[PDB]
């Protein structure tokens, strides 16, 4: 009965505070649920594991214990595909969560560019594989291929950081979902303000 009643505290004026009530059941406090990653099945066969907990109202709440694949969205483009997350880096909350590759709502991680690479290719005619072969278009320029241009000319100035990411195969993104609460793990792809920044934490972190 790990409770959370604010009784076992000390009122403003730090004087101990009285109790007449045994711990009451609605102050429930469930066992924490650290969330790891299977981006290393060196031991861990069963890729992802999610256990459902019977919550109050009568509903179920799925709890993420072990995972390997989540869903992520590229802010800029409005694209979202399910991908395989790689390694967790910098958890902010604490560095131990990174050491155990645990999944916090706001844990910054890596993903496979594959789905985004695949897409950025189909909609712009730009693979993002090593720079030289850059574009891959059609043979004749009379029909609908005229659009991959129109979009491509949209000065798709995807930050020098977004570019490097793709080619390296790794992609930076933060999460936005309580695994211990919904069982999933969804995140947005890192960019501008935070990208530049979180990276800094990483550059200086190792150096």
């Amino acid at each position: 009965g790990i409770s959370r009643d604010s009784k076992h505290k000390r009122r403003a004026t730090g004087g101990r505070m009285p109790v007449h009530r045994k711990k009451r059941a609605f102050e429930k406090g469930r066992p924490i649920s650290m969330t790891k990653l299977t981006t290393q099945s060196t031991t861990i066969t069963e890729k992802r594991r999610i256990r459902p907990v019977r919550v109050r109202g009568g509903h179920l709440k799925f709890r993420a214990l072990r995972l390997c694949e989540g869903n992520f969205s590229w802010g800029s483009e409005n694209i979202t595909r399910k991908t395989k997350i790689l390694d967790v880096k910098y958890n902010a909350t604490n560095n131990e969560l990174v050491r155990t590759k645990t999944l916090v709502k706001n844990s910054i991680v890596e993903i496979d560019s594959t789905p985004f690479r695949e897409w950025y290719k189909l909609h712009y005619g730009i693979d993002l594989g090593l720079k030289k072969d850059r574009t891959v278009l059609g043979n004749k320029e009379k029909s609908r291929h005229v659009q991959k241009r129109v979009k491509r000319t949209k000065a798709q100035a995807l930050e020098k950081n977004i570019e490097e990411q793709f080619v390296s195969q790794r992609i930076l993104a933060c999460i936005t979902s309580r695994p211990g609460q919904s069982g999933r793990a969804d995140g947005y792809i890192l960019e501008g303000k935070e990208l530049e920044f979180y990276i800094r934490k990483l550059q200086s972190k190792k150096k």
Binding site: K9, A12, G75, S76, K193, F197
Partner: protein, 157 residues
């Protein structure tokens, strides 16, 4: 680089625009969360063109204000964006048919927008519990001068 990192590990907004804004390369991109609690309250000029990321603000967040609204003098400036206001009222005494003085202390949250100072009258609103004590946010600040002891100062404001 300052308002963003400054120790803490990140500071976005409720309306996650940012980096995506680079998509609307012509109009105004520098959006920040804008609001208006209303209830006959003006929204601070400073609140709008600020870089501050205070989730516990009543103009920069999905923090509501409901019912109880307060006016009280300020005691301390210490604490991170939190202040203690002291209210001074009289209590009646059934028997002797007279009053005595009394003071309740209140934990108030202060969005960066308005600038504090010790010993000034402040107006708090009733916002959801933000912490053990906090349950009030500042909405309107009036600067005032008290030459010395804030404790000595007792006004049926």
């Amino acid at each position: 680089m300052d308002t963003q990192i400054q120790r803490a590990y990140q500071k976005q907004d409720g309306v996650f625009l940012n980096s995506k804004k680079l998509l609307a390369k012509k109009t105004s991109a520098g959006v920040r969360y804008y609001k208006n609690i209303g209830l006959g309250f003006k929204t601070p000029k400073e609140a709008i063109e600020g870089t501050y990321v205070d989730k516990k603000c009543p103009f920069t967040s999905n923090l509501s204000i409901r019912g109880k609204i307060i006016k009280g003098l300020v005691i301390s400036t210490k604490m991170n964006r939190t202040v203690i206001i002291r209210r001074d009222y009289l209590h009646y005494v059934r028997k002797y048919n007279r009053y005595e003085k009394r003071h309740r202390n209140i934990p108030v949250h202060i969005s960066p927008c308005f600038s504090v100072k010790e010993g000034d009258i402040l107006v708090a609103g009733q916002c959801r519990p933000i912490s053990k004590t906090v349950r009030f946010n500042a909405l309107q600040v009036v600067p005032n001068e008290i030459i010395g002891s804030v404790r000595k100062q007792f006004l049926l404001f």
